[PDB]
Symmetry: C3
Subunit: 296 residues, 3 copies
């Protein structure tokens, strides 16, 4: 796109503030930002806030979100579809023109780990170029295993294709498949979908801990066979809904856009790969690491 040549808009922080016991304001940008997706490979991504996947959103069950999208892209319209919300897509997930803002309000009625993404046609183009992310809706009554959890992180799986190539997006295998992590608490890492960061800078934990991961596969096109090497999931909540409880799973199948809360125990010191067992995708980047030490 001629108007994107040389454009690299610095990342902008997510803005969130609570405005009532059940109402929250969220402000995000659409922007065009260079991201290193593999060593030596820059992708001039279409993003929310200069991150791909975008910044984490966390709200409580029953919160109404008053969402503003500020479109920094000089030429392409953008939009937002939160899978957490009940909304009229033709009224509430509509386009915001370049250099404009739009505000939309809708409730997050349902607990879980939801995809969000741009909803502008062609949606495949917007998602594949980077406009995806996760919103977590915390359950009013928690999960039954909350008291057992020692530490928690968020991990997101996505693919990357040939740059802005709709043929490839439709018809081609992914060039890379990758994990990222998005921060829940101060000091947690906050990374973009790339082949290397979570190998070189593993997630950290302590021997004996029960770890919870909030996970989502944003696609755009592939399913995920999510597995932590050297453990078994004690408990799994599909889509993060407390009612969708499974136990003792080796691997969690996630559709495109599918989420889960998964919990597992790390019994011994060492480094534990986190993979999709679709090993062509693992080979193409989709391995993260969890370093487990006597201290954490």
């Amino acid at each position: 796109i001629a108007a994107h040549k040389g454009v690299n808009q610095a990342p902008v922080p997510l803005k969130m503030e609570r405005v009532g016991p059940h109402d929250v304001h969220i402000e995000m940008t659409a922007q065009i930002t260079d991201i290193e997706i593999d060593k030596g490979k820059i992708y001039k991504a279409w993003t929310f806030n200069g991150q791909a996947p975008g910044p984490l959103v966390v709200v409580n069950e029953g919160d109404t979100i008053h969402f503003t999208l500020k479109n920094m892209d000089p030429v392409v319209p953008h939009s937002m579809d939160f899978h957490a919300v009940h909304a009229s897509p033709s009224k509430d997930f509509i386009d915001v023109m370049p250099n404009k803002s739009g505000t939309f309000t809708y409730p997050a009625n349902k607990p879980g780990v939801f995809m969000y993404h741009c909803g502008t046609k062609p949606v495949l183009q917007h998602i594949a170029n980077g406009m995806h992310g996760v919103i977590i809706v915390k359950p009013k009554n928690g999960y039954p295993t909350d008291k057992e959890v020692d530490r928690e992180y968020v991990l997101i799986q996505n693919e990357w294709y040939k740059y802005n190539d709709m043929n490839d997006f439709q018809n081609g295998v992914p060039s890379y498949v990758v994990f990222s992590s998005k921060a829940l608490k101060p000091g947690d890492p906050n990374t973009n979908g790339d082949t290397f960061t979570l190998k070189e800078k593993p997630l950290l934990a302590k021997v004996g801990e029960k770890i919870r991961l909030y996970i989502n596969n944003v696609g755009p096109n592939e399913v995920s066979s999510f597995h932590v090497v050297g453990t078994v999931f004690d408990d799994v909540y599909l889509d993060g809904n407390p009612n969708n409880h499974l136990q003792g799973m080796q691997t969690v199948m996630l559709p495109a856009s599918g989420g889960a809360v998964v919990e597992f125990t790390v019994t011994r010191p060492g480094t534990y790969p986190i993979v999709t067992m679709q090993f062509n995708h693992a080979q193409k980047g989709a391995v993260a690491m969890l370093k487990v030490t006597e201290t954490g």
Copy 2:
């Protein structure tokens, strides 16, 4: 196939009649019928009854089906495999020669939303050319959420490949991925798998309604990541079995041949896309629309 050149057999209605409190007669054809799968693209499909996917079958749990297949194809044998039934495949799902009929009897013991398809070798060829469909078996005791449902429809996902091309069928990406709808009540739409009908003529509903969809992904080759934009599934019954209850799912993973009953609320007026979140498939046709109005 030389004997198919110029053949376009007009669609024939499904024939069904109940013959006892737990016995039903069903009569279907195998026939060769031109279907417009995308604008300007005719596929000379191999079909049941001139529809692809084929006509909807609905029976009750515990019904024995006395099924007749009348093979109108001038040269290729055809057969029927209902995933609802208990049967001997080598006796009951056998071929019917051109210009012949065959009758087979078997029970539908299990509630749910089942694939049916031709079982003639090579089965991939017969399915890919269009010989697939859905049989619904209604549970004796309903679903627990029956009283909440305001409206219901059937949606089927399938792929289309290069015409009658076994190489492509085995080794190629789908050319199109599509939804169709099959009528449960008078006045419901009844459409074939194409890229456009359910966009131009959306399914209809009223503001505030809880909608039930009976869904099946007939493949032949892909899985489906089924999602209704702007809502969350309140309740999901995998394969349509009441016992396989999930709640609050954003997206339902369906294997090839996989079914579900899904229920969700439409809170606001507007048009709600229905998609597979495998967005390469959505781009290649797999988007239907639900138009929600103050009146329905």
Copy 3:
């Protein structure tokens, strides 16, 4: 690999012995063995014990496994990752050099049907060349439907690609997709992943029996839409964990590495195909047969 030219190491039996009420010794080889994966097609597989998938391992819930790998490969290191166990991957799933042995100990805390596979980088290469298999961990308290089961077998799904071709492994469609069966009791068949054995020598059963299959899809890359033609699964336990109970499923979605226990009734004499309903894969080999007779 120059050092593999002409190498065809005869299969070696699995060695297992119980050494305590909750401790078992297991001894396996890594070895290079020619396997006929399709008629006229030899693949010089990388294997455990000269089988691909490897030999079945069965232990009890709560058993600690003291595992020895003897690496017969003259040049490539190999390793073992059991998905059943809790272990430190960087200490316990490490490489064993050519002509060396290594011993590792870890507990199998969780009931189910788990993948095992080589964990040597590149893991895709090692899995795709044949180093995969299944370990069953029997639940302390059984399954609730145990008393209903008349007969049982193990079936494994895997893919085969162009020989030792990392490009193909990453980027290509499978050349073959196949079932194998691994013996639980004397007289059961024990076969390798090939397109033909379980068609020419079907699994056997008797009219009216409830059959249990312990199943796993080891990939490396595809998901499986597992279906037995002419029946419906009465009961399904995802990953073989008794708590993950589904009923009345037509088809069981398995991720890559995913397992299940599935149970179904065969009501009539005949031959019952066992397939993945991803019919491109079925066409490329993934059909097994179950022959049901008045005597068994």
